[PDB]
Amino acid sequence: EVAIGIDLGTTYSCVGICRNGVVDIIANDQGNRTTPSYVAFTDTERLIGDAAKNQASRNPENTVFDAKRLIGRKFSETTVQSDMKHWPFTVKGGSDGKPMIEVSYQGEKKTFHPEEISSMVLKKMKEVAETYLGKPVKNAVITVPAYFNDSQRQATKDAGAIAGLNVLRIINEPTAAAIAYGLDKKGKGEQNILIFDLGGGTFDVSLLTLEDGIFEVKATSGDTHLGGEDFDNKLVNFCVQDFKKKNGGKDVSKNSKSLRRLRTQCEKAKRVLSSSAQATIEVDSLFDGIDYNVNITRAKFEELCMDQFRNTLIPVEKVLKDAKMDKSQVHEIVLVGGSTRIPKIQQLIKDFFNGKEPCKAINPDEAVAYGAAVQAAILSGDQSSA
Ligand SMILES: Nc1ncnc2c1ncn2[C@@H]1O[C@H](COP(=O)(O)OP(N)(=O)O)[C@@H](O)[C@H]1O
Numbered sequence: 001e002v003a004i005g006i007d008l009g010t011t012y013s014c015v016g017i018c019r020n021g022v023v024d025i026i027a028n029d030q031g032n033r034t035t036p037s038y039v040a041f042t043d044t045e046r047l048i049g050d051a052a053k054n055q056a057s058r059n060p061e062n063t064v065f066d067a068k069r070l071i072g073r074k075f076s077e078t079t080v081q082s083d084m085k086h087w088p089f090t091v092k093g094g095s096d097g098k099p100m101i102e103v104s105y106q107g108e109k110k111t112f113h114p115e116e117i118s119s120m121v122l123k124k125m126k127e128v129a130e131t132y133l134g135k136p137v138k139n140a141v142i143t144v145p146a147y148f149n150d151s152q153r154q155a156t157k158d159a160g161a162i163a164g165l166n167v168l169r170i171i172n173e174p175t176a177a178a179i180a181y182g183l184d185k186k187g188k189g190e191q192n193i194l195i196f197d198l199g200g201g202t203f204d205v206s207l208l209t210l211e212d213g214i215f216e217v218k219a220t221s222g223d224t225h226l227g228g229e230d231f232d233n234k235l236v237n238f239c240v241q242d243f244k245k246k247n248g249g250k251d252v253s254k255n256s257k258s259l260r261r262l263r264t265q266c267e268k269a270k271r272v273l274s275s276s277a278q279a280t281i282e283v284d285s286l287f288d289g290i291d292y293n294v295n296i297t298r299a300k301f302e303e304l305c306m307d308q309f310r311n312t313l314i315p316v317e318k319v320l321k322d323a324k325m326d327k328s329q330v331h332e333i334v335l336v337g338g339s340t341r342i343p344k345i346q347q348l349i350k351d352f353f354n355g356k357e358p359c360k361a362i363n364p365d366e367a368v369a370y371g372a373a374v375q376a377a378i379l380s381g382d383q384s385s386a
């Protein structure tokens with residue numbers, strides 16, 4: 001009976017349930033409404049979600065993340081060759097050409113396919129829903145990026161089956177976000193919808209058309225390597241240079257543990273800067289036992305990220321051009337992804353669309369799961385959300 005919607009994200013995943021026409025986004029064990037798409041292996045245990053992300057800096061080789069970048073891909077693909085520089089964990093090619101992620105678990109070398117790592121994240125999301133409901137959950141709708149090919153979609157579905165889920169359907173992330181806002185029902189005439197999705201690792205812009213409850217993806221564009229992690233890197237690079245000026249040229253970047261600890265604090269300061277004018281980046285005993293402290297204003301963060309923020313409009317202009325339509329023809333702009341909380345990004349999009357207010361009532365890092373939950377309820381025979 002019970003069907004859930006799961007946003008299986010690059011950096012974070014989210015699970016929702018639509019009951020009685022209302023959608024509940026389910027908080028995990030730590031009270032978090034999203035769960036990191038991280039799986040770690042230690043001498044004693046297999047950690048998933050928050051616990052895995054929290055020990056990543058102390059166990060880099062055996063903490064897996066970004067499996068969505070490998071799922072359904074052949075190890076020889078150029079995107080794998082390029083992305084692998086960003087991973088402290090080992091990835092090798094199997095005889096079937098599939099990527100094999102190599103970790104140490106309980107003193108033993110273990111290998112996993114990307115869909116096996118994703119199945120562990122999906123199993124955690126299934127368990128999050130089950131703890132909340134107090135009952136087993138078998139059915140699910142899982143979302144994927146609109147550009148995912150047949151191999152990537154099938155491997156995502158296989159990850160669901162391995163997790164014990166009966167995958168009712170694989171749907172597109174931009175379409176799930178549009179469904180969450182009821183843009184398929186509220187209109188009932190021709191509607192052009194722009195989905196602006198800026199997450200932790202990726203940026204996706206999708207232009208949809210909705211005529212008579214039917215969504216079609218007209219054009220997609222973005223940058224598979226632009227996200228919140230790149231804005232954190234701008235703060236890291238600044239702090240590394242600031243530490244040099246304060247401590248006689250000492251280079252924090254030569255110690256990978258110092259960089260990871262600094263990156264953790266840079267990301268926290270960035271989030272604070274979305275609702276405050278200032279934030280403090282503090283790392284006690286950062287490098288060579290030296291304490292680090294700096295105050296970052298929202299203006300300085302906006303300056304370091306100025307080009308990256310402005311360049312988010314380029315894929316917007318590209319989808320409009322590909323779809324042969326003017327920006328004035330866009331009926332709704334939906335903000336998806338945790339990075340859309342950055343005020344400067346919201347302002348740039350509003351100004352680009354001539355003052356039009358974007359749809360951001362649903363927590364942007366929850367809108368995809370929210371729409372998947374609605375679709376899961378419809379596919380289960382529940383018409384209450386209509
Ligand atoms: N309040 C905030 N301001 C700025 N960025 C924020 C934020 N809350 C979350 N984020 C960012 O959102 C990114 C995660 O986006 P999210 O939509 O959850 O994940 P995903 N798997 O789709 O990439 C992270 O880089 C995080 O720093």
Ligand SMILES: [Cl-]
Pocket residue numbers: 001002003004018019376377380382
């Ligand atoms: Cl249900």
Ligand SMILES: [Cl-]
Pocket residue numbers: 132133
């Ligand atoms: Cl309940």
